[PDB]
Amino acid sequence: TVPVALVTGAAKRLGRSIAEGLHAEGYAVCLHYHRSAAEANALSATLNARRPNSAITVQADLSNVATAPSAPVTLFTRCAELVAACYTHWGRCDVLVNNASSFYPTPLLRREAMETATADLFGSNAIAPYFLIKAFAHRVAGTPAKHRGTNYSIINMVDAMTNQPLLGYTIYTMAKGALEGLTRSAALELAPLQIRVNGVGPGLSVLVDDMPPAVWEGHRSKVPLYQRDSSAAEVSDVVIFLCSSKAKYITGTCVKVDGGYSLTRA
Amino acid sequence: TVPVALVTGAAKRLGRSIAEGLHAEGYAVCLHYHRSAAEANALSATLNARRPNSAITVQADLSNVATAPAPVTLFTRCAELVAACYTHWGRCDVLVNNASSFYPTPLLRREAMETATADLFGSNAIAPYFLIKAFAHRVAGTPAKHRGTNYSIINMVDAMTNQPLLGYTIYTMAKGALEGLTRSAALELAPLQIRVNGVGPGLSVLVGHRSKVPLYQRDSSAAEVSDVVIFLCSSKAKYITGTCVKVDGGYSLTRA
Amino acid sequence: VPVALVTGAAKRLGRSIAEGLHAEGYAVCLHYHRSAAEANALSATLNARRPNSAITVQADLSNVATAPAPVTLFTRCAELVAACYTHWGRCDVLVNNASSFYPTPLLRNDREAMETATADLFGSNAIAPYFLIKAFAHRVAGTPAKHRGTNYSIINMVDAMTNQPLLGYTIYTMAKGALEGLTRSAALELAPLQIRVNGVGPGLSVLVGHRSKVPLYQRDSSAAEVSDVVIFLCSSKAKYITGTCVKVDGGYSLTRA
Amino acid sequence: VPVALVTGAAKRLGRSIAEGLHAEGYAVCLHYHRSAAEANALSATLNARRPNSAITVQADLSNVATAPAPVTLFTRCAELVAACYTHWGRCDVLVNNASSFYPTPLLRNDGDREAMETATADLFGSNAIAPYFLIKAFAHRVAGTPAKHRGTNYSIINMVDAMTNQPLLGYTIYTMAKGALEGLTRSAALELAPLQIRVNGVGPGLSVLVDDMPPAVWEGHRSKVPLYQRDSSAAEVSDVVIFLCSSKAKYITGTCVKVDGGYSLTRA
Ligand SMILES: NC(=O)c1ccc[n+]([C@@H]2O[C@H](COP(=O)([O-])OP(=O)(O)OC[C@H]3O[C@@H](n4cnc5c(N)ncnc54)[C@H](OP(=O)(O)O)[C@@H]3O)[C@@H](O)[C@H]2O)c1
Ligand SMILES: NC(=O)c1ccc[n+]([C@@H]2O[C@H](COP(=O)([O-])OP(=O)(O)OC[C@H]3O[C@@H](n4cnc5c(N)ncnc54)[C@H](OP(=O)(O)O)[C@@H]3O)[C@@H](O)[C@H]2O)c1
Ligand SMILES: NC(=O)c1ccc[n+]([C@@H]2O[C@H](COP(=O)([O-])OP(=O)(O)OC[C@H]3O[C@@H](n4cnc5c(N)ncnc54)[C@H](OP(=O)(O)O)[C@@H]3O)[C@@H](O)[C@H]2O)c1
Ligand SMILES: NC(=O)c1ccc[n+]([C@@H]2O[C@H](COP(=O)([O-])OP(=O)(O)OC[C@H]3O[C@@H](n4cnc5c(N)ncnc54)[C@H](OP(=O)(O)O)[C@@H]3O)[C@@H](O)[C@H]2O)c1
Ligand SMILES: C[C@H](O)[C@H](O)C1=Nc2c(nc(N)[nH]c2=O)NC1
Ligand SMILES: C[C@H](O)[C@H](O)C1=Nc2c(nc(N)[nH]c2=O)NC1
Ligand SMILES: C[C@H](O)[C@H](O)C1=Nc2c(nc(N)[nH]c2=O)NC1
Ligand SMILES: C[C@H](O)[C@H](O)C1=Nc2c(nc(N)[nH]c2=O)NC1
């Protein structure tokens, strides 16, 4: 009676906090990672030490490109394999959290760089979530009704601030917009299977501080509530609540966790 | 520390469920009511039997009119609701603006048209404003060292008002005003760490469009809505403010 | 010759809207509250360009009773619309532009001043528009189908920035929120009468340093930059548009602190 | 004489947009993918009305490389914009209208790789990725123009969809791509504001609704629209696009305007 959660980009920061929060609620967790192998395996060791066989790790580039094997492996296949990993190891997959995401500039103003940025930003933020949801849904539909879990839930990590675009981040902002569209469309189409699909949108959380202290403090001070970025738990606790049975009438909605930052203007 | 919650229109349906859910979390609750005196007092007896001195009831018409004592204004009646919490328990940590009148005000086929305006706008928008203002003043007037650590205001909005119910214009306008109050108060009260959010039901505890709700094809139970209210008031939701959460089973995703 | 009723038409945006509609051929009823001299000067100018193409009517749109029994806001609103029918026999366009705008701080930081602020802010920005729309619609419904105009349009002047609240302006921000709700509800309910209802939301316009924060041009807009949008929405080319609010803010709502 | 580049201009809304801009005095570059005959007929008509006021250019805006090394989508987009500069020496307006639209069901019931792989590249490419590369090329051309030679009314219009927030069942990728296009509208509006290039969206509800279905079914669909109980004509949408490109709309940017007759106001 142990539910299973698949969390993408689970090695650190918010994803790790989400994986820890779901684990604390009793979930067995599949921790996906791309380049953070060491951090992911350390997290798994910790959770497995607290509760045997309660965590595994799986690696996958969620960029929208074909990888090397036979023939080239497509993104859809790599996504189907992540979900399959949960069924193979534990025989179920109740929760999917699309958290993995690349984030960097793609200025409109002044080849392989543009080609890869597009595939990477859109892949991790939108296309992989789409294939992952599709595979997740196919698994549930293919499960005899009597054997289906009673609390399926998909959480897409969106962004509370994309409607007030960050200058120079167009592809990323576009991908997050696509991800909001996926949240609504999948919520409507998967409703018959009682699979809920919602979004959680952070404002500033564990803000990257690779800049002069005054600039990092200036940025944080703009959040109306508390004048700081949020901790990882302040975001993950909301993800955990939406996956809980008490949130079962909630679907197709995006919940901002931004301390009022989207309420500000220049 | 035993926190206090003020819930308007708490006698039955969603408000009753919200008052019960907050009480289950440990809150002492002030149950406001307008005409449902018997149910409000029965609810209070039940909660007080579970935990002595954990509930009181207070009556008030939240319509935007003057009542008989000079005439008493809506603002004064609202300030007295919040004062009731401070007088009895010395604090007021949570305010849930749930009370609300709801009935048609067709644009196509002046005593009832004016009481309708005062009633629909008062309960749904103006009283919430005065209640929030009084709640905030009491917190500002409390020495920092003596302030609670988890202030939260929840405005009960409506997930479907952007797809207007035919013939309910004033009500739809009032809920729109209540969304604006949610955002403006969240911004202005952020310095006092008072969070302000909204919860918007779709169809709940219906007493025919039921089958059009995408998820489960039914209206929600009262708890399916109140559990969300309770979560937003919890410390786990402390970075959330100025936001409205739909609890509608995907109903706002539909089209004719 | 179509007729337009424009509230708060004496100056700034309302004046520009009245001028823009007049330039398209509309006869205009200029409503004013305290700006009698500016309203009458505007009317003289328009009537000099085209005889009997403008009139002025006074009314406090605050949600209170006035002395002549007491006159209610609904009655004063119905009389504004009736003024158009009495003088010209029609009312094709209604522009709810009149609006009070001032602080109503939640935090302290005389006592009836709240009573009047509430009635004034909510009345001009939300309640009067409601009564005006209701009266406008009843007159169209009461007109035999064969004699109805072919291009009914109501424009509500909303605010592009209210979702990023101005600190201390709660009642005003709430009232504009109610006005957006009226725009959608009325659009839906009046669609059968082919009465379109939309909103135009300025960001910063004709300001009496914030300006420099607007992405496009780094300045507030001119009155015409807003009114030309109102005029377009009332034109027959915009006839499939209803229930929608159009921001005219130079990208200001796209900014963050 | 200003110049407008309209993608998917051979028929329906794109044709109407090209005709509307042409009637205002614009020279128009009509892009097409498979509708060569329609596109050339439209160009002949416009050129007969005003010599050298239209050209046609072909391009698959799907997000795939084409045969010439392989040609990338970005290059094909840059060449569309370049065609306007090469022929007329300018490009003032860009209307991203081209768009593929068909089902991509999450469930089968609730060869193969080819239809998925191509659907994703096609739906996302036409509706979101090509618009991005076209906007980027359009902007680079303006930035590279000495201030003294720049046009005075640059405007980009992205054709979005008023109903995507009430998703059409089974059209997830398309719905996602339109969401991305709304994000592009806001992000580019903000970033290009310094060059006075405005970027807005126009979102139809139901327009010139395809009627390949029983008449009672087609009538039932259009009857749901609150205003007039019908889908819109092509002009009812294109006149809005033309207004947004006009100098009277010069303070408008970053916004999406619904042209849906109130359809998004309905609920099931
Ligand atoms: N932090 C904020 O302020 C903030 C604000 C708004 C929205 N969000 C959203 O909240 C979520 C979590 O935020 P975060 O700051 O914790 O994220 P993050 O640290 O930037 O990245 C999360 C993980 O995503 C993975 N990832 C990136 N590209 C990938 C790819 N192409 N294929 C597979 N995996 C990839 C990385 O895994 P490896 O390390 O294993 O390679 C990374 O650890 C994201 O969706 C983000 O957009 C965060
Ligand atoms: N139920 C739904 O499907 C639904 C859908 C969308 C939004 N909502 C919102 O959720 C909240 C709760 O909904 P509900 O169905 O439980 O509400 P409800 O039963 O319609 O009414 C709640 C209480 O509001 C009080 N009230 C009404 N007018 C008042 C006035 N003028 N002054 C003082 N109190 C007044 C009444 O108290 P007395 O009985 O004591 O007089 C009533 O019991 C409301 O804000 C509602 O708008 C509900
Ligand atoms: N200007 C901006 O930056 C801006 C920004 C966002 C939204 N808007 C909106 O655009 C519209 C026009 O803006 P604006 O700056 O031109 O407005 P404004 O100058 O502030 O006022 C317009 C007119 O409203 C009338 N008015 C105010 N209270 C009234 C009342 N209680 N009863 C009757 N009339 C009343 C006044 O008429 P009298 O002078 O005759 O008394 C005033 O001339 C308004 O709805 C406003 O909210 C403007
Ligand atoms: N019609 C409606 O009710 C409606 C509703 C909401 C939104 N919209 C939006 O309004 C715009 C115009 O609508 P519409 O009905 O006129 O569109 P449409 O007829 O479905 O298609 C427009 C053109 O897009 C081109 N196109 C499709 N895929 C392409 C690709 N991969 N590469 C290059 N070109 C491609 C086609 O050109 P060729 O014929 O030359 O191949 C087609 O003629 C679209 O963005 C649409 O999404 C329309
Ligand atoms: C720095 C920026 O203002 C904001 O904190 C965001 N950070 C991130 C993001 N997305 C990811 N994947 N990682 C981040 O650190 N979206 C927005
Ligand atoms: C019936 C309607 O469709 C919907 O369930 C609503 N009900 C109610 C409401 N508001 C109140 N106060 N009471 C209701 O029963 N808002 C919307
Ligand atoms: C000053 C403020 O930031 C903004 O320009 C607004 N001005 C006004 C407004 N409303 C009115 N009636 N008058 C104004 O001058 N709404 C917002
Ligand atoms: C048929 C549907 O309800 C609606 O009219 C749409 N049609 C179209 C669309 N997009 C394109 N490209 N073509 C269409 O015909 N988006 C939505």
Task: List the domains of chain D with CATH numbers.
Answer: 1-268 (3.40.50.720)
Helix (H) or strand (E) holding A75: helix A75-90
Q: What are the Cα distances from residue D249, in Å, to B191, D11, D58, D143, D192?
A: 39, 26, 30, 22, 16
Contact between B89 and B67 (Cβ < 8 Å):
no
C245-248 vs C195-202, strand pairing mode? parallel
* Contacts with C249 from chain A: Cβ below 8 Å: none
Q: What are the residue numbers of the active site of D?
A: 174
CA distance A36 to B163: 45
Side chain identity at residue B123, one-letter code: S
Contact status, residue B142 vs residue B85, Cβ threshold 8 Å: no
Ligand 8 pocket residues where CB is under 6 Å: D 99, 101, 161, 168, 206, 209-210
Q: Report the 3 state secondary structure along C48-100.
A: HHCCCCEEEEECCCCCCCECCCCECHHHHHHHHHHHHHHHHCCCCEEEECCCC
Q: Count CA within 13 A, CB hemisphere, residue A207.
A: 19
DSSP string, B71-121: PBPHHHHHHHHHHHHHHHHS---EEEE---------S----HHHHHHHHHH
What is the nearest CA distance from A12 to chain C, expressed in angstroms?
27
Residues B114, B120, B125, B126, Cα dihedral to 10°: 40
Question: Which method was it determined by?
Answer: X-ray
Phi, psi for residue C158 in degrees, rounded to 5: -100, -150
Counting beta carbons within 10 angstroms of the beta carbon of residue A260, is it exposed (0 to 12), middle (13 to 18) or buried (19 or more)? Answer: buried
Residue type, D79: E
User: Quick one: angle between helices D130-143 and D172-192, nearest 10?
Assistant: 10
- At residue A176, the 3 state secondary structure works out as helix
Report which DSSP code applies to D264: G
Between CA B1 and CA B47 the distance in angstroms is: 18
Give a three-class secondary structure readout of D122-176: HHHHHHHHHHHHHHHHHHHHHHCCCHHHCCCCEEEEEECCCCCCCCCCCCHHHHH
Burial-class residue C242 by CB neighbours within 10 Å (0-12, 13-18, 19+): buried
Provide the resolution (angstroms).
2.2
Tokens of B128: 């919430």
Atom of ligand 3 nearest to the CA of C96: 45
Chains in touch with A (3+ beta-carbon pairs under 8 Å) read B, C, D
CA dihedral A253, A255, A261, A264 (to 10 degrees): 30
CA distance A3 to A8: 17
For a substitution probing ligand 2, which of B32, B39, B41, B100 has the most ligand atoms within 8 Å of its CB? B100
Q: Contacts of residue A249 in chain B, CB cutoff 8 Å?
A: 215-216, 220-221, 224-225, 247-249
* In contact, B102 and B160? CB cutoff 8 Å: no
Of the candidates D74, D72, D42, the one whose C-alpha atom is nearest the C-alpha of residue D56 is: D42
What contacts A91, CB < 8 A, 6 or more positions away?
Answer: none
Stated length of chain A: 266
Contact A90, A4 (CB under 8 A): yes
Contact A186 D107 (CB under 8 A): no
Helix (H) or strand (E) holding D31: strand D27-32
| Gap from CA of A202 to ligand 5 centroid (Å) | 9
Give me Rg for the CA atoms of chain B: 18
Q: Is B103 a catalytic residue?
A: no
Assess D49–A contact: CB distance below 8 Å, yes or no: no
User: Residue B212 corresponds to which amino acid?
Assistant: K
Cα(A55)–Cα(A66) distance, integer angstroms = 27
